[PDB]
Amino acid sequence: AEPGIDKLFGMVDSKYRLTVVVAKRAQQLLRHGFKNTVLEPEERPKMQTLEGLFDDPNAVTWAMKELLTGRLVFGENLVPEDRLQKEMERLYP
Amino acid sequence: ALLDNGRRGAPVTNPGSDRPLRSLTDILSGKQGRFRQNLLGKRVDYSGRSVIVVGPQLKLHQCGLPKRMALELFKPFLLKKMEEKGIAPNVKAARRMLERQRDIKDEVWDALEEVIHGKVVLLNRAPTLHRLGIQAFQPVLVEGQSIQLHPLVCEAFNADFDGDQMAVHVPLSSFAQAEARIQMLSAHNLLSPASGEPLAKPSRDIILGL
Amino acid sequence: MEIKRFGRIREVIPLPPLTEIQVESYRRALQADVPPEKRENVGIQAAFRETFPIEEGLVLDFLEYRLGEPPFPQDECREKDLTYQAPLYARLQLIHKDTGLIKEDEVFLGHIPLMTEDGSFIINGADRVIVSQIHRSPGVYFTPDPARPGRYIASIIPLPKRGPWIDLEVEPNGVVSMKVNKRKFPLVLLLRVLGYDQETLARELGAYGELVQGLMDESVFAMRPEEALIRLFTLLRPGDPPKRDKAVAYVYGLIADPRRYDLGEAGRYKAEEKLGIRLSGRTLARFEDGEFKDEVFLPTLRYLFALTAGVPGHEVDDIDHLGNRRIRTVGELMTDQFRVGLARLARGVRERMLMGSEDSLTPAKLVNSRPLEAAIREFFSRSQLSQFKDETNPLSSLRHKRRISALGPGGLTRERAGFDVRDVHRTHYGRICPVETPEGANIGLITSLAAYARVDELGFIRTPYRRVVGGVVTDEVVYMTATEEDRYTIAQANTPLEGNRIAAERVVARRKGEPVIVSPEEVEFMDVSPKQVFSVNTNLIPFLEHDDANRALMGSNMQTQAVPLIRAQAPVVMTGLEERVVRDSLAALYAEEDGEVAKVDGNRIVVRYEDGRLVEYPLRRFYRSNQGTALDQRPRVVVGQRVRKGDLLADGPASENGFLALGQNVLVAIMPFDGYNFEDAIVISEELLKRDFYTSIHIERYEIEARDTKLGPERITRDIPHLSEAALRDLDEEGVVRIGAEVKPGDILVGRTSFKDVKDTSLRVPPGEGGIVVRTVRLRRGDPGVELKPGVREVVRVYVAQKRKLQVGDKLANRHGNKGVVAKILPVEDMPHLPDGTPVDVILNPLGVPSRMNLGQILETHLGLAGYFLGQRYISPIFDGAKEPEIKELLAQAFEVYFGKRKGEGFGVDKREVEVLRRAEKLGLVTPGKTPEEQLKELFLQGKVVLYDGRTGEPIEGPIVVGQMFIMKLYHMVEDKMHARSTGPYSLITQQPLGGKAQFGGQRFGEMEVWALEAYGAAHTLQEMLTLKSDDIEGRNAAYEAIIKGEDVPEPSVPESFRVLVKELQALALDVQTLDEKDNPVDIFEGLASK
Amino acid sequence: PAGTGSDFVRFTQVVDQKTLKAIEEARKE
Amino acid sequence: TSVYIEDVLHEFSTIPGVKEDVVEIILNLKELVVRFLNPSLQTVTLLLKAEGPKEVKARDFLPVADVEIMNPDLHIATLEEGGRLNMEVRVDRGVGYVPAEKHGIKDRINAIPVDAVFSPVRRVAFQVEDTRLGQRTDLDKLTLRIWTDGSVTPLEALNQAVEILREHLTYFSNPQAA
Amino acid sequence: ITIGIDDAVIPEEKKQYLEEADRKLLQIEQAYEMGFLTDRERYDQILQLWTETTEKVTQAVFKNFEENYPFNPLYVMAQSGARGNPQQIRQLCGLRGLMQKPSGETFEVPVRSSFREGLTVLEYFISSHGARKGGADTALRTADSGYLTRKLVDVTHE
Amino acid sequence: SMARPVSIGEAVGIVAAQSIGEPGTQLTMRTFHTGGTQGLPRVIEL
DNA sequence: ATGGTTGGGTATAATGGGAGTCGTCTCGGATGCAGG
DNA sequence: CCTGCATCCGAGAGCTGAGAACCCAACCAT
Ligand SMILES: Nc1nc2c(ncn2[C@@H]2O[C@H](COP(=O)(O)OP(=O)(O)OP(=O)(O)OP(=O)(O)OC[C@H]3O[C@@H](n4cnc5c(N)ncnc54)[C@H](O)[C@@H]3O)[C@@H](O)[C@H]2O)c(=O)[nH]1
Ligand SMILES: Nc1ccn([C@@H]2O[C@H](COP(=O)(O)CP(=O)(O)OP(=O)(O)O)[C@@H](O)[C@H]2O)c(=O)n1
Ligand SMILES: [Mg+2]
Ligand SMILES: [Mg+2]
Ligand SMILES: [Mg+2]
């Protein structure tokens, strides 16, 4: 099972809401090249190859771990989408 | 006859045959018609099928996937990964390399292992009687040509190992992967939606030993 | 190895030729070698005698026919894609009615396909089999009325497409009404046409009471038979003018014309026996002197009335009784098609006769033969009874030739067949196998002829019985139908005998299918053998009496799918039928007479017979069967060897010294193993692969064509642009790959260039295929016997072979219905082994036994252990063979060998053996108070040995069943099934991915998969499946580009199938329009369809 | 209109703490 | 490990004048037991030339230095009058079971790779028996039974097995932190 | 865990249970040969006698397994729920019992042999009717059940 | 399937249809053993 | 300027066709017939 | 006039894999 799946299921009123939040966070992470993450380098998901440890390329794992950290806010009508997108570009080129 | 062939009297047939001509209504309706054959169900890309064998060493969330099957299923991601590395100068060269079996090298398998990291695939056995006839699994690349299935999901699939075959599908986007990993993962579906009783539970040899 | 055989029943007669149902039937239909003066009136001779004479004056009369020699041999027909056939010639005479001018001519009517020696046909270069069809026999039947109890319905049924079914029923008002062509009308008018008065009916039917009073009608009777004829015609054909001659012709053709109405010979016999009358012909009524006379109508009315009155000696008819159901063989079906073609030929001949100068008319000019070829060719290429021959192994072909089908033209339909016609009838005993049938929608509709059964000349299956008189069983054998069988008390074949007298006061017998116990005096007949109850395939399962019928069905079916192996062995335990099976399949080679072997080669044997005549037999080597298996014959004699008549010379495929060899004998242990044999999976040793066990040879054929195009011809050549020599290495100077080259997916087989100034259209190895190129064939235009399609200049075929070893995912099975895929191949050091160091080869899970109830495999394993240690093989006939005490005695001898071997070398009992014996003492398997050797012998007599674990060296805590088992490899191999696709070809109209592995197609995500995705709430995955992966053209293009560039896949659009639906709804004059939130139109066609 | 396609859940937004505050700092102006 | 036969292009063919086809000949050749007298020697090529009519056995191979055939009576082929057999058989050192599709060894163009079963040991058993010594009881007596093919004696195989086990036991001597 | 032919233990009481039955049958025949019984009642009493005898044989088989061989492989499989039910175990050990004609009515004589003892040809042919009928049942009812499922989906999908 | 209150948005109609249909496909009057208004027809009638 | 394609004409007399299909079973609505 | 009662017609019947007149003359197209 996914780690902390019970916690994630208990953090939302509907499991489909959790799926939507995870997918949207993963899209945000993919767009900005993992520069907008709330994880500090020691918590970054790692992947093992012959060359060595690198960052985990899967964005869904990153989004799920970030949701476990609890530093993300989700809800209805928090911020207008256009302003969010413009700010995301401005902070992360 | 043009609108509805074979309604009143003898249907119109082509000379030298007794097969009735297929009118517009014949196209529209029936089990073979447009609605049921092309709209409520379709043939899809990024899919395969193979014989299944028992996977006793697998974990509940894992399935054994053949190497060549994974190569064909994840080909675009693989092309991107090999272009990013130094395996091929550009995507066309990578495709040309992958189109000839003897032109495949060692590092492309490592690139493939990089590609599928964390991703899941969908396994389906016909007939899909309930929703647990499709389940999501993390693929472990194996040698050979047979899909390896966990013993504890066979009862949900109603699968045995006397010649059964299964189909494999690859969800593409972040939304589809999140849905498969959160909602359709095998380790997240342990109780029956019909009765609430456990459906992934010891059976056959496990019960016998315990 | 010494062969020991069990059983006490002695068989008086041998099995009949197993393919005679085809060979004899076609020989009788053709009558090729019979001089024309002594030809009987059956077969195509009957068709000629029935179609002719042609009268319309000029007359055309048939004299005789002959069949020429085939233009090409069988091998040439197979190679050049021709039909193995013989030319047909007919000698005809054109006669003037008055002048008497005789014009005699031999006419070429075309070609008739020829049945080979084994009973198959070569149609367009492919081997085909015609499957026999079971149907309701023609005749007169009486059935209960379902709506009204106490009432009965009479039916007259002719041959298929040879007349209408006619129904007779006593209506509630008492008026008897006959239905023909869906028209109820009183029978009294037809009785009047037949020439029956009030007095005649009263005398012939007076006894039966009020039914005749209710039948009576003076208005019809007062009329003359001519007026009755016209009234009948205008009742049957409302609107048509009531001309006297037109009505005469119509009624004559309906029931009285031999060219239209035809009760068969079987129908005539059935009518005569049921009605107790003698029929003059095969039709319902006779036409002489411009008048109709009855033949069947009055007897059927008498039987119907007597049945309704309850007169003794008249019964109802069972529709599924095998005396009421008959078999049409290949000859009869071919003759029917020939008759249809001859009818077309005669119709054309009459058309041409009624035209043209009568002086310039000759026999040759009148006959246009084309419809005859049309009928025969359509039968032999398109009929569902004409099937692509199954030749995975010789037993497959032998099974296919003995199949009986209820489907086909003029048969039942798969989806609407009820339980009644699919049930094992009591009359199937000894005629149709109750076990071998296909599972699925075809259960009960396709069956198999029993081993001893023979189809008679009328089409009824007969089975043999021994005559017993005064309680003494004789050697006289009588072949009887179900109707004849119903009249006697028949004893079981296993009735104990002393000499040939029945030595038992109580005899188990059958009376009309009911089991009974009778005294020996009451016995009339005895069964010949238990073998006669089951088919050939079911007769190859030893210990069948210990198997449940369902798993026996599975094993009998799966014996057909076994693949020939390069090291095939005959079973350790046989039923005694393998030699006959291999002999009757014509797969091996036998000596025609006593002689001496002169030359032995891998492809040739020269034998010198006593008459000084040298005979050379070529050996068929590495020939691709229809299913891709390689069939070769291997010599089994040396130069100078003395051969008697019938002695084996060369083994065929799946044969070992003249015995059927479908698999291998392996050492098996029945125990669970680490979950690797979970749910019917099988664990094997690598040592099997080390000695090339379960290794098969398979051949694949690839075809390419170079043809003519309007933009320029295609050319097969080596000169191809834009490829390096690394891809051009193996092709020879003609552009075709050289023999012996190893080919892998992506390699070129035949190079071809097509005009665009040329582009590559070469033939390459498909993914997952390849092997060694073993054959190449080039066919060009103009070579003798070649008939290419127009526009095609040349064709190239390449035959590539692979040697397949056993691998994970391959299917194995035994003869008792146990099947499973190999799930794990273990190294030899990990397999469980005997105390002497011998490892087992196969580990089977015991959990498959208790619910399947096939205990025959356990007994086979015990006898195999006995044979393994005694070094011998066994013959165990079904229902008469080895029993438990005999197996215990054999196991006692085997244990003495198996333990004296260890005792002579100076070894006692192992410590692990002692601990296992103590545990088994707890289990109650051995008796306390005995020495370890006594307890080991005790365990051995139960088929169990002490087994050691290869991983640890410690014993398995309990004794384990170990022994030899015969296991076959099935053609379902993972190599042929593994398939995957990312993107590929799409369909023309729906723009959806194609289907099938050969087309590089994709898997179907059907309705129920969509239901499962909906039940999961995975909206986005389902939308991806519906649009981005199937038929959203711009969507799938953008998705592929985004993945190739590293972005995420875009949003989907409307699938093309919905646009197709909208366009097709517009074609039906329906305005389907998509609207936005304000009910304003939204254009999903982007403006490409707006003026 | 079920699961993640339901109107009850499919309009959910997600944002970190850093971006959320400065969007208010823009509104606070 | 490899076989080359004259005027033979692949393994699925026949040779005129020879009773057995190539597949059966290779099956027969897989039973050949060859002993290398020199430990440094890695590969050898045995030459066979025969003309019918005769029974070609393993003894008909041309002699090679430091190479012995342990089963000269092994039947290879049967030749009639007019048949000829010309073979070059490459034999290698190795370990384990290596299929032909893995190594794919070809000397010439028309050579046929052969599945190699390198293990010279045919069968191994061991027996544990009751023994004692003075006052101690329930002691073990071990007996190893080894059947080989003659290329390697049972004692040599036992010594190599002991050496392998000792070398593998050596590996537990370098702890590393995780 | 393994399965041998001796693991299908046949209880002794079965023989007794058969012989006693062969007693009662005679009585029934007598009660019909003298006139105190009609045809339907005789058929029904024979069927009831045989079904009760089959039940007794099943009870004896499982009682023997529980008392003498608690670790017997078939018994362990049936008790643990791994594989098998009492009816199949009885068919392996005690007796198959009554069989049905294709019309749906029972035969008068039962199959008194188990699968370990081996059936006779007549008994095998008698059981073939039920085997074929079950196969046809599966083949022609699975379609009706799938049709019902489709109807339910099209009525509740919203 | 989760032993907790159902989440808003669950397609319970499809789940109900599958739950009713699945046992009928196999276990209702699977392999029948020939040994010594009912079943599916009654359910379809209802 | 050539083939390829299209339109027109034939004169003893002729005057209403022909294959086919009969082994499903239920269920629901539309409907004509019987009674009162 | 109403009603009920046989009668007739139409629409269903699981999923996946694979498999036969001839001739003559004018006329547009390229
Ligand atoms: N959903 C589904 N699953 C099935 C089905 N039937 C079997 N399974 C699974 O497969 C395992 C092994 O079953 P089997 O041991 O029976 O093996 P098989 O592959 O079915 O092959 P066959 O023994 O039939 O050999 P054949 O030469 O007759 O095959 C050629 C002929 O078979 C028939 N046929 C072959 N292939 C299929 C197929 N894919 N689908 C349907 N009909 C098939 C067909 O009529 C064809 O024309 C079982 O346990 C189940 O999981 C089925 O109907 N549906
Ligand atoms: N037409 C079909 C035939 C089969 N199947 C599927 O195949 C399985 C095994 O049927 P099967 O007959 O192969 C064996 P099973 O009944 O499990 O075996 P046993 O009692 O002898 O041990 C069924 O449970 C269905 O899921 C199908 O969907 N459509
Ligand atoms: Mg199965
Ligand atoms: Mg099963
Ligand atoms: Mg099947």
mmCIF file of N, CA, C and O and ligand atoms in Angstrom, chain B residues 125 158-164, chain C residues 680 819 852, ligand 3:
data_model
loop_
_atom_site.group_PDB
_atom_site.id
_atom_site.type_symbol
_atom_site.label_atom_id
_atom_site.label_comp_id
_atom_site.label_asym_id
_atom_site.label_seq_id
_atom_site.Cartn_x
_atom_site.Cartn_y
_atom_site.Cartn_z
ATOM 1 N N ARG B 125 -8.835 -8.975 -16.466
ATOM 2 C CA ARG B 125 -9.180 -10.310 -16.934
ATOM 3 C C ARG B 125 -10.649 -10.346 -17.324
ATOM 4 O O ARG B 125 -11.514 -9.963 -16.532
ATOM 5 N N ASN B 158 -11.006 -13.962 -10.280
ATOM 6 C CA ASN B 158 -11.488 -15.288 -10.675
ATOM 7 C C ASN B 158 -10.525 -15.940 -11.662
ATOM 8 O O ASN B 158 -10.933 -16.551 -12.650
ATOM 9 N N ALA B 159 -9.233 -15.804 -11.393
ATOM 10 C CA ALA B 159 -8.195 -16.284 -12.286
ATOM 11 C C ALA B 159 -7.519 -17.520 -11.711
ATOM 12 O O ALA B 159 -7.328 -17.642 -10.499
ATOM 13 N N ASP B 160 -7.162 -18.437 -12.603
ATOM 14 C CA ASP B 160 -6.290 -19.552 -12.263
ATOM 15 C C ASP B 160 -5.163 -19.604 -13.284
ATOM 16 O O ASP B 160 -5.007 -18.676 -14.083
ATOM 17 N N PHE B 161 -4.374 -20.668 -13.272
ATOM 18 C CA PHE B 161 -3.150 -20.729 -14.060
ATOM 19 C C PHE B 161 -3.135 -21.986 -14.912
ATOM 20 O O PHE B 161 -2.166 -22.747 -14.941
ATOM 21 N N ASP B 162 -4.244 -22.226 -15.610
ATOM 22 C CA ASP B 162 -4.352 -23.305 -16.583
ATOM 23 C C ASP B 162 -4.517 -22.758 -17.999
ATOM 24 O O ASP B 162 -5.145 -23.391 -18.846
ATOM 25 N N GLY B 163 -3.959 -21.581 -18.263
ATOM 26 C CA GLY B 163 -4.028 -20.969 -19.579
ATOM 27 C C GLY B 163 -4.679 -19.603 -19.620
ATOM 28 O O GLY B 163 -4.909 -19.085 -20.721
ATOM 29 N N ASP B 164 -4.995 -18.993 -18.480
ATOM 30 C CA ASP B 164 -5.641 -17.690 -18.474
ATOM 31 C C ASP B 164 -4.721 -16.619 -19.047
ATOM 32 O O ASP B 164 -3.495 -16.703 -18.955
ATOM 33 N N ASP C 680 -3.301 -24.704 -9.862
ATOM 34 C CA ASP C 680 -3.086 -25.481 -11.082
ATOM 35 C C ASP C 680 -1.777 -25.142 -11.789
ATOM 36 O O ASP C 680 -1.541 -25.668 -12.878
ATOM 37 N N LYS C 819 -4.561 -29.899 -16.241
ATOM 38 C CA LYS C 819 -3.827 -28.981 -17.097
ATOM 39 C C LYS C 819 -3.244 -27.855 -16.257
ATOM 40 O O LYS C 819 -3.794 -27.490 -15.216
ATOM 41 N N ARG C 852 -11.920 -32.114 -8.426
ATOM 42 C CA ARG C 852 -12.071 -32.567 -9.802
ATOM 43 C C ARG C 852 -12.452 -34.037 -9.889
ATOM 44 O O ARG C 852 -13.018 -34.456 -10.902
HETATM 45 MG MG MG J 3 -8.878 -21.298 -15.807
#
